Each structure stands twice: as structure tokens, then as C-alpha cells.
């Protein structure tokens, strides 16, 4: 190609490829080693990661342990399941992150039989507190936050999901200086601002501001709120009822899966180019050579 594209044979030969998930830019292996590596004097104890990822339009919350063959998911919770609990808009905001953390916490505790014990913070007030072990009883299920490549900032939705999982009764070691409301100038967090974020107060205040200001912007954003008759002041009770429903039934009813996997595969196979055989490659080479009766 150019004088620097189509790299030299020696460069290609001596190039060492990174791990595939490093090439893809998806796995920080430096962080993963420290997240996954277990104290050798426990010999089987899986280290459980609360893996929180944010795609556009969805929040993924998994609880993952590591094996040689690959990571194993104990429980998973997605923000696209929040419509079942009564959240249909802002499925990637801070309140949805908190809801998904609460959902994964409740679902995992139910799966482990630790739902009745370790109820968590049912009365949410935005206070910083960890899940405490019960006297003469099993210790709380301990997981470690895995933000992946997401940057650690004060107010991040990943720490929203952390707060949700911790309030749900999972013991997730954490500090409070990354929550919204943490006063960087002092040593304490603003619990009312944290609770506001938990219940979507920032979004509702934006809705009211945009209403009292130019209205075509409030018809472009929050259009679904207008079409669903969701006023700004209803967000707090929407998220409250969502938390109650999550605690009531965090049992992961899956989707009905219409067009079953065989039909899925059959339909996907039509738009799938298949590799040519060596006979076909030789035939194409012969065709290209014979195309020069003279020279082009």
C-alpha cells in the first residue's frame, strides 16, 4: 500500500499479539489479575466479582467467579428487566443503576438462600453503610466491584450500581467518596443528594427545569415521559415502587423465546458467507490467470 502500510515481513513475524480481549480493548488484565487471584491458602474459594457494565441503552450487572475454562455467572441482572418492576425510561441513568444493583443483590441472595437474613437497607436514606454480618449466623455474601475500564469518578453510575447492590444485602466493600454528594472539600457525603440520585432526583429536577425553560427541548428529551403521562415528581415513587417490586420478586422470569434457537440459527445462516474450499480458490486463481489471453 503506502510507504508505511502493508508492514514489513520481519515486523509481522516478530510482532507479539496481545491477549484477544486486550486487542478488542475490553479486558484490563492488570486489574483482572488482582480481582480474580485468590489467596492460595483457601484453595477453592471463588472470588466473586460484581461486574457492572454500561452499554448504550442497557446496564449489565453480573456476579461472576473465575475458573480455568472460563468465567462462570452465578446471577445476572439487566436494566432491560426493569420494565417488569415498573421502570420504563432512563434505563441507563443513576437510578436505574441503583435498581439493577438492588435487583442483582436480591436475586443472588435468593439463589444462595440468604434473602431472609441480610435484608440490607430497606429504608433507603442515602446513608453510607456496609452490609454487616449477623451474630451467630452466616457471613454476608461478599463480592468485589468490577468496573472494568470505566473511570472512577465521583457520581458514576457504576458506583450507583455498587450502592444498589450493597443496599440489597450483598457485602460489597467500598468507600463513600465516589457517590454523588461526597463533599470533596470535607470528609463527609451529602446523604440527601445521594438519596436524590438513588430516586432519580437529578433527572426530575432537570425535567422541571426544562419545563420552566424552553419546552421544545423538553419535548425532545423526556418525550416518552409525556407520552406515558409521567410527571417529574412521580419519579421518586416510581423508583420506590420499583425497589419494592424488586425485593418482592427478584426471581428472574426469563423471556418466552419465540422463534426457538434452531429457527434462530436457520434464519441467521442465510446472511452468512461461507469459506470457499481450496478447490474453489484454485479455480478462481486459474480463472484470473486465464483472463489474460494476452495482457489485460
Amino acid at each position: 500500500a503506502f510507504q508505511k502500510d502493508a508492514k514489513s515481513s520481519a515486523y509481522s513475524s516478530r510482532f507479539q499479539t496481545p491477549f484477544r480481549r486486550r486487542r478488542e480493548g475490553k479486558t484490563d488484565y492488570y486489574q483482572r489479575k488482582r480481582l480474580v487471584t485468590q489467596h492460595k491458602a483457601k484453595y477453592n474459594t471463588p472470588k466473586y466479582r460484581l461486574v457492572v457494565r454500561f452499554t448504550n441503552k442497557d446496564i449489565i450487572c453480573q456476579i461472576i467467579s473465575s475458573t480455568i475454562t472460563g468465567d462462570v455467572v452465578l446471577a445476572a441482572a439487566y436494566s432491560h428487566e426493569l420494565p417488569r418492576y415498573g421502570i420504563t425510561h432512563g434505563l441507563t441513568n443513576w437510578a436505574a443503576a441503583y435498581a439493577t444493583g438492588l435487583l442483582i443483590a436480591r436475586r443472588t441472595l435468593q439463589k444462595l438462600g440468604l434473602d431472609e437474613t441480610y435484608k440490607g437497607v430497606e429504608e433507603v436514606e442515602g446513608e453510607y453503610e456496609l452490609t454487616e454480618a449477623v451474630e451467630d449466623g452466616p457471613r454476608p455474601f461478599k463480592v468485589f466491584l468490577d468496573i472494568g475500564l470505566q473511570r472512577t469518578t465521583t457520581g458514576a453510575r457504576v458506583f450507583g450500581a455498587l450502592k444498589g447492590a450493597s443496599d440489597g444485602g450483598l457485602y460489597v466493600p467500598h468507600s463513600e467518596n465516589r457517590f454523588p454528594g461526597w463533599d470533596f472539600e470535607t470528609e463527609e457525603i451529602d446523604p440527601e443528594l445521594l438519596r436524590s440520585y438513588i430516586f432519580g432526583g437529578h433527572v426530575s429536577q432537570y425535567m422541571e427545569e426544562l419545563a420552566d425553560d424552553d419546552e421544545e427541548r423538553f419535548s425532545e428529551l423526556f418525550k416518552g415521559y409525556l407520552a406515558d403521562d409521567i410527571d417529574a415528581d412521580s419519579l421518586e415513587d416510581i423508583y420506590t415502587s420499583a425497589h419494592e417490586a424488586i425485593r418482592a420478586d427478584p426471581a428472574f422470569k426469563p423471556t418466552e423465546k419465540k422463534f426457538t434457537k434452531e429457527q434462530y440459527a436457520a434464519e441467521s445462516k442465510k446472511y452468512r458467507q461461507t469459506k470457499l474450499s481450496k478447490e474453489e480458490r484454485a479455480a478462481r486463481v486459474a480463472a484470473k490467470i486465464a483472463a489474460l489471453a494476452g495482457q489485460q
Binding site: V285, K288, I289, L292, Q295
Partner: protein, 215 residues
């Protein structure tokens, strides 16, 4: 005051090249390795004759230069300056060392004997194996006797045994003469410089069309 070559005939030492650990090595006596009609195409000079070592020994750069000069002079004055391409195919990369005990009888007073005897760079030599080609020369088949005699004259400048071998290759290529002729008539050989390039059945068909229009 150069030491006689018998002192450095044999490959007694490990290879001792000029490097970051020598930095003080004299220049080789032979600086020109390709001479005669070195621009001639592969087709011009089909015959190849080799002066080939029959010993594992060292050839000094002085001996290499003397033999190159002798062979070139004979072949030039007999067949013409441009009737051949002579290539010296051994390079004097091994540095010879000398521990200097020079003069001034009474040297036991100002000399340390064998203490700290590591020598300084004295000269250069090529390390040659049995069967290793020392000289190669391509020419026309009509110049075979002249080229053989030139190599035979150069043979006197070297220690040890050398042989004159008429190669079965075409010139300086690694192809037997029938095989090179076959590739040439098939059109898969192109003159690049004094050497050629060969068409391979690998690589992109676009480039294999652009070069070697044998299609």
C-alpha cells in the same frame, strides 16, 4: 614487520570479529570483492568456476588481496577487462592478535613475560571450511581455460590446498544450467541487476502479473 602466516594458519581461536569489544582493528587488505564485468547480466556469463578450499584454515586478508590481484591481472590481460566477473566469496572477519616481544636485548628487564599476554589486533583473516568457495568467477564457456588458469595462478598465494571446480550452475545462480535455461524459456526469470529475479507460484497474482509477464 608482519608475522609469517604460518603463525595464524589454523582456526585455533573462537571467532574474534571487530565489534564494540575491539574498536581498534586495522583495515582489511582486501577491500574490493567484485571485479571484472560485475554489471554483466546473468545471461552473459553462463560458465562458473570456483576456487574451493580443501582445508579448515584461515586465509589472511593480505593473501586474499594478493590472490585477487593476481587472478584479476591474469584474466584481464589474457581475456580482456570485461570478459569475466570475479567475486571473492570469503571476507576476513577474524581479527588476529599479537603479543609483542619486539627488540632491545635485555627485554627481561622491561617485559612482563607471559603476564598480561592478551594480544592487540594484528591483522585480519577469513575462516574457511573444507569445500568452502574462496573465489568464484563467471564468464563465457569460451573463456574456461583463461579463467581456470587465473584461479590456478591465484592458488599460489594461499596456504593449504585449493581445488578448481567447474560449477554445474549457471553463472552465480543456484540453478543447474538446464534448469536455468528451462526457467528462461518459460519466461519466469527477469534481469534485475547483474543478478536476476525468479517468478514464484506464491504471492499476489497482481504482482506476479506485473512482473514476469509470462502469461
Amino acid at each position: 614487520a608482519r608475522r609469517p602466516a604460518r603463525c595464524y594458519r589454523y582456526q585455533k581461536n573462537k571467532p574474534y570479529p571487530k565489534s564494540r569489544y575491539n574498536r581498534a582493528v586495522p583495515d582489511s587488505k582486501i577491500r574490493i570483492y567484485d571485479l571484472g564485468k560485475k554489471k554483466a547480466t546473468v545471461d552473459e556469463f553462463p560458465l562458473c568456476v570456483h576456487l574451493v578450499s580443501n582445508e579448515l584454515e584461515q586465509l589472511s586478508s593480505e593473501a586474499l588481496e594478493a590472490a585477487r590481484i593476481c587472478a584479476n591481472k591474469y584474466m584481464t590481460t589474457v581475456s580482456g577487462r570485461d570478459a569475466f566477473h570475479l567475486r571473492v566469496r570469503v571476507h576476513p572477519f577474524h581479527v588476529l592478535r599479537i603479543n609483542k616481544m619486539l627488540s632491545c636485548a635485555g627485554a627481561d628487564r622491561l617485559q612482563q613475560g607471559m603476564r598480561g599476554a592478551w594480544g592487540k589486533p594484528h591483522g585480519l583473516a577469513a575462516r574457511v571450511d573444507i569445500g568452502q568457495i574462496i573465489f568464484s568467477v563467471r564468464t563465457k564457456d569460451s573463456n574456461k581455460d583463461v579463467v581456470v588458469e587465473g584461479l590456478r595462478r591465484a592458488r599460489y598465494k594461499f596456504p593449504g590446498q585449493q581445488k578448481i571446480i567447474l560449477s554445474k550452475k549457471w553463472g552465480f545462480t543456484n540453478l543447474d544450467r538446464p534448469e536455468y535455461l528451462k526457467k528462461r524459456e518459460a519466461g519466469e526469470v527477469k534481469d534485475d541487476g547483474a543478478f536476476v529475479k525468479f517468478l514464484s507460484k506464491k504471492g499476489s497474482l497482481e504482482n506476479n502479473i506485473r512482473e514476469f509477464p509470462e502469461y
